[PDB]
Design a protein around this motif. Structure first.
Motif, PDB file in Angstrom:
ATOM      1  N   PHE C  43      38.114  52.939  27.822  1.00 45.20           N
ATOM      2  CA  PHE C  43      37.128  53.126  28.883  1.00 45.20           C
ATOM      3  C   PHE C  43      37.071  51.961  29.848  1.00 45.20           C
ATOM      4  CE2 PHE C  43      32.992  52.632  30.887  1.00 45.20           C
ATOM      5  CZ  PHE C  43      32.908  53.805  31.601  1.00 45.20           C
ATOM      6  N   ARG C  44      37.406  50.761  29.406  1.00 42.93           N
ATOM      7  CA  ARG C  44      37.546  49.724  30.418  1.00 42.93           C
ATOM      8  C   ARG C  44      38.937  49.780  31.050  1.00 42.93           C
ATOM      9  NH1 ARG C  44      34.114  44.445  28.569  1.00 42.93           N
ATOM     10  NH2 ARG C  44      35.250  43.220  30.150  1.00 42.93           N
ATOM     11  N   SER C  47      38.110  53.999  32.562  1.00 39.74           N
ATOM     12  CA  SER C  47      36.797  54.184  33.214  1.00 39.74           C
ATOM     13  C   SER C  47      36.414  55.610  33.635  1.00 39.74           C
ATOM     14  CB  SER C  47      36.608  53.203  34.387  1.00 39.74           C
ATOM     15  OG  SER C  47      37.382  53.569  35.514  1.00 39.74           O
ATOM     16  N   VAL C  69      28.022  57.567  30.412  1.00 37.48           N
ATOM     17  CA  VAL C  69      27.875  56.715  29.240  1.00 37.48           C
ATOM     18  C   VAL C  69      26.428  56.268  29.113  1.00 37.48           C
ATOM     19  CG1 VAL C  69      28.735  54.750  27.936  1.00 37.48           C
ATOM     20  CG2 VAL C  69      30.274  56.000  29.371  1.00 37.48           C
ATOM     21  N   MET C  71      23.913  53.750  26.649  1.00 39.68           N
ATOM     22  CA  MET C  71      24.097  52.577  25.799  1.00 39.68           C
ATOM     23  C   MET C  71      22.800  51.946  25.319  1.00 39.68           C
ATOM     24  SD  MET C  71      25.842  50.576  28.960  1.00 39.68           S
ATOM     25  CE  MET C  71      27.294  50.903  27.955  1.00 39.68           C
ATOM     26  N   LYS C  73      20.337  49.564  25.421  1.00 41.63           N
ATOM     27  CA  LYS C  73      19.855  48.683  26.476  1.00 41.63           C
ATOM     28  C   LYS C  73      19.601  47.245  26.008  1.00 41.63           C
ATOM     29  CE  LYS C  73      16.605  50.938  28.459  1.00 41.63           C
ATOM     30  NZ  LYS C  73      15.934  51.797  29.473  1.00 41.63           N
ATOM     31  N   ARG C  74      19.220  47.095  24.743  1.00 42.57           N
ATOM     32  CA  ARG C  74      18.946  45.784  24.160  1.00 42.57           C
ATOM     33  C   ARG C  74      20.229  45.109  23.686  1.00 42.57           C
ATOM     34  NH1 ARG C  74      13.585  45.828  20.329  1.00 42.57           N
ATOM     35  NH2 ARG C  74      12.134  45.041  21.932  1.00 42.57           N
ATOM     36  N   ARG C  76      23.019  46.019  24.132  1.00 42.61           N
ATOM     37  CA  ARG C  76      23.933  46.124  25.282  1.00 42.61           C
ATOM     38  C   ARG C  76      25.334  46.643  24.964  1.00 42.61           C
ATOM     39  NH1 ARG C  76      21.785  46.114  29.641  1.00 42.61           N
ATOM     40  NH2 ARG C  76      23.878  46.466  30.534  1.00 42.61           N
ATOM     41  N   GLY C 110      32.082  31.115  57.555  1.00 41.11           N
ATOM     42  CA  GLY C 110      30.841  30.984  56.815  1.00 41.11           C
ATOM     43  C   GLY C 110      30.275  32.264  56.225  1.00 41.11           C
ATOM     44  N   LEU C 112      30.397  36.202  54.063  1.00 42.97           N
ATOM     45  CA  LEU C 112      30.672  36.630  52.691  1.00 42.97           C
ATOM     46  C   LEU C 112      30.995  38.128  52.527  1.00 42.97           C
ATOM     47  CD1 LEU C 112      31.171  35.798  49.877  1.00 42.97           C
ATOM     48  CD2 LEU C 112      28.829  34.914  49.751  1.00 42.97           C
ATOM     49  N   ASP C 114      30.598  41.192  50.991  1.00 40.63           N
ATOM     50  CA  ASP C 114      29.543  41.862  50.236  1.00 40.63           C
ATOM     51  C   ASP C 114      29.767  43.372  50.225  1.00 40.63           C
ATOM     52  OD1 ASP C 114      26.294  42.871  51.429  1.00 40.63           O
ATOM     53  OD2 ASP C 114      27.024  42.934  49.365  1.00 40.63           O
ATOM     54  N   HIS C 118      28.878  49.322  45.592  1.00 38.88           N
ATOM     55  CA  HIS C 118      29.889  49.034  44.573  1.00 38.88           C
ATOM     56  C   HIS C 118      30.731  50.271  44.185  1.00 38.88           C
ATOM     57  CE1 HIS C 118      29.337  44.736  43.051  1.00 38.88           C
ATOM     58  NE2 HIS C 118      28.425  44.836  44.001  1.00 38.88           N
ATOM     59  N   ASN C 119      30.154  51.468  44.303  1.00 36.61           N
ATOM     60  CA  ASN C 119      30.843  52.699  43.895  1.00 36.61           C
ATOM     61  C   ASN C 119      30.612  53.915  44.789  1.00 36.61           C
ATOM     62  OD1 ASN C 119      31.090  51.139  41.117  1.00 36.61           O
ATOM     63  ND2 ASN C 119      32.431  52.938  40.992  1.00 36.61           N
ATOM     64  N   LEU C 172      28.251  39.207  55.199  1.00 34.41           N
ATOM     65  CA  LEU C 172      26.938  38.630  55.462  1.00 34.41           C
ATOM     66  C   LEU C 172      27.045  37.207  55.999  1.00 34.41           C
ATOM     67  CD1 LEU C 172      24.195  39.928  52.992  1.00 34.41           C
ATOM     68  CD2 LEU C 172      24.955  40.741  55.251  1.00 34.41           C
ATOM     69  N   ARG C 175      24.233  30.792  54.360  1.00 33.52           N
ATOM     70  CA  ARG C 175      22.872  30.514  53.862  1.00 33.52           C
ATOM     71  C   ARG C 175      22.171  31.797  53.382  1.00 33.52           C
ATOM     72  NH1 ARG C 175      19.429  27.261  58.027  1.00 33.52           N
ATOM     73  NH2 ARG C 175      20.876  28.620  59.136  1.00 33.52           N
TER      74      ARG C 175
END
Lengths: 144, 136, 175
Positions: C43-44, C47, C69, C71, C73-74, C76, C110, C112, C114, C118-119, C172, C175
């Motif tokens: 799965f890694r 995926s 998936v 999981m 939560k605690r 993890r 200067g 970034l 970003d 993400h998906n 972005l 600072r």
RNA sequence: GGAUGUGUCGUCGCAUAGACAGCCAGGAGGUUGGCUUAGAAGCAGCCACCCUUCAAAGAGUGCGUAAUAGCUCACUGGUC
């Protein structure tokens, strides 16, 4: 006074007569003569005139000196080749100039026993590589 | 930090943390282990801490937020006559729940800025990286 | 991948390190249980667009993309997986991670890199030729330029379930 | 909060192409890179890490100097 030799790499201004910050007792504290370096180094700056030519000095004993005066890192006659006297603050947020490839034939023909490379392309690409930290972009590359 | 206007007052209870136990907004993320309370300054702390470490300036995601009014009576009175005025504010962070997400820095910066962050808190903590993919 | 069990009682596993399970074909749906080790590995490796095979301890290999998936939560770690047994020609609405390529010119003044998403929730290539990732050149971006879902590329035979103007990976300020 | 205490499971990397460590030698020329500065020249702070060759060598990491120089490692080769 004594005989304990020394191998001293330094750096000195060309046509002047150094004050207290540079030399003074910076190489004369082992044992050497100053009288014939104020009148023997400032006379060959009548050769190449106006750039920080590097100096190396080897000291024996008594009152002995044997120096070598190399090739000025044209970070003087290139800073001028742009528009700023004091170099760029940050080479990637504020620039200087843009020299031609034919002003890369005075750093690759004064430095014959320095840029220890064999070819001309290499001996140009060296200080042209220096020509990046000075904050300058090259009028060069493939084709052109 | 503090909020704007509200109800005023409170109480308390516990049992595990709802959401969001997932690594959004960032590549790297620090996660609580204890059913704490957390205060305005307790977090502004880590704000200023990590914001020291990252320089100019990273990208820092405070996934928690104080909304709870906690009181203390005036010092030295016998109980009765009231409930305490609002002393301070609290985010009721439960475990597995994730408090900090950052990216725009590397792995070392996450490890360290999170280390210094977690040395400011009433909780043991674990830092990690993404994969919690139920919804990005 | 390969399971063994499928009851309702989980003492056959758990400690012995296997994950609670479902996998539906859509006319065929089956509960089961699959050893943790392998599942994490693959799965890694593969995926949420991975696709992999289910040779149940009976002898009936199957075609499986990973769907949901769920999981602890605690602690993890994962405790449960929803599958989707793929069909044939038409698939579903794949979720695929936006990446970033090249030393961008946006990070030299200067700024970034970003990834404001993400998906990415696309639509259908066909359930055997799926994009695992994506590649959004960022070089052209300076500081203050975003990339809408229009500018996002494609591999051909695919459609974008996402609004063609909302912001994915944008540079972005400092600072 | 800290610990090569000591057992158990698991991740990751490395070498029969010579490993982690022991000792051996380079640890280089541009270049005091530029900014900054009374001077910072690897090393007080601000944007950047480009080349020459190589068995290998990176505007480099620490002790240091007011700054030099100078001592060790990142890699490289002989050994085991």
């Amino acid at each position: 006074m004594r005989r304990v030799a020394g191998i001293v790499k330094l750096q000195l201004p060309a046509g002047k007569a150094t004050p207290a910050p540079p030399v003074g007792p910076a190489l004369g504290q082992y044992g050497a003569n100053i009288m014939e370096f104020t009148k023997a180094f400032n006379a060959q700056t009548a050769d190449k005139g106006d750039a920080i030519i590097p100096v190396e000095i080897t000291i024996y004993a008594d009152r002995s000196f044997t120096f070598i005066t190399k090739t000025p890192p044209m970070s003087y006659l290139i800073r001028k080749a742009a528009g700023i006297g004091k170099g760029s603050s940050t080479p990637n947020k504020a620039k200087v100039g843009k020299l031609n490839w034919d002003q890369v034939l005075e750093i690759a023909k004064t430095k014959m026993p320095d840029l220890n490379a064999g070819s001309v392309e290499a001996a140009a690409n060296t200080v042209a590589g220096t020509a990046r930290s000075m904050g300058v972009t090259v009028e060069g590359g493939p084709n052109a | 930090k503090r909020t704007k206007f509200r109800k005023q007052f409170r109480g308390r209870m516990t049992g595990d943390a709802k959401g969001g136990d997932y690594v959004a907004f960032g590549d790297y993320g620090l996660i609580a282990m204890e059913p704490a309370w957390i205060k305005s300054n307790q977090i502004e702390a880590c704000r200023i801490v990590m914001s020291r470490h990252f320089r100019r300036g990273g990208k820092i995601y405070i996934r928690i937020f104080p909304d709870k009014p906690v009181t203390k009576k005036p010092a030295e009175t016998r109980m009765g006559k009231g409930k305490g005025a609002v002393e301070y504010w609290v985010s009721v962070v439960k475990p597995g729940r994730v408090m900090f997400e950052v990216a725009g820095v590397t792995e070392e910066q996450a490890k360290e800025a999170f280390r210094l962050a977690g040395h400011k808190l009433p909780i043991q903590t674990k830092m990690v990286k993404r994969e919690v993919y139920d919804e990005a | 991948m390969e399971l063994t069990a499928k009851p309702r009682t989980p003492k056959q596993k758990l400690d012995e390190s296997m994950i609670a399970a479902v996998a539906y074909n859509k006319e065929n749906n089956v509960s089961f249980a699959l050893d943790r080790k392998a599942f994490d590995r693959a799965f890694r490796q593969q995926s949420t667009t991975g696709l992999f095979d289910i040779t149940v301890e009976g002898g009936e290999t199957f075609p499986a993309l990973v769907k949901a998936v769920q999981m602890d939560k605690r602690k993890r770690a994962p405790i449960h997986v929803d599958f989707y047994m793929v069909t044939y020609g038409e698939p579903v609405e794949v979720s695929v991670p936006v990446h970033t390529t090249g030393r961008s010119q946006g990070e030299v003044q200067g700024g970034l890199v970003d990834i404001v998403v993400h998906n990415l929730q696309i639509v259908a290539p066909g359930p055997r030729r799926i994009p695992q990732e994506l590649v959004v050149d960022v070089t052209k971006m300076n500081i203050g330029d975003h990339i809408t879902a229009g500018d996002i590329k494609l591999p051909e035979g695919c459609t974008l379930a996402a609004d063609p103007e909302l912001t994915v990976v944008s540079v972005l300020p400092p600072r």
